[PDB]
Amino acid sequence: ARRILVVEDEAPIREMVCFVLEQNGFQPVEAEDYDSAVNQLNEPWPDLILLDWMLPGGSGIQFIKHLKRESMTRDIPVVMLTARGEEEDRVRGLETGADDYITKPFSPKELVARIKAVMRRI
DSSP states (O other), rough: OOOEEESSSSHHHHHOOOOHHHTOEEEEEOSSHHHHHHHHHHSSSEEEEEEETOOTTTHHHHHHHHHHSTTTTOOOOOEEEEEEEEEHHHHHTTTOSSEEEEEEEHHHHHHHHHHHHHHHHO
């Protein structure tokens, strides 16, 4: 119920995210790229995925769209991680299937708020 898959290749950033999550009672799981993220999709299944738009190895769009093909993954909420500004406004306009978005450098308060709100919904 608190298994959060964190898909971010930059170590310090990925660690900042995991620290905020762990300190807040969540159980973070790390992935550094498209394929390693895909390798985490099995029981126990992530309850939420934080997806870096710029993850190496593939398209964040296809990653999300491919989740909708199976029972155990189609209702997992995905929050797209985006760089503040241009990328953000831009990615928001794409057909990604993301349930919500969070901008980097991230705000610990926004990270927890959006995860709380997204899970309440989805």
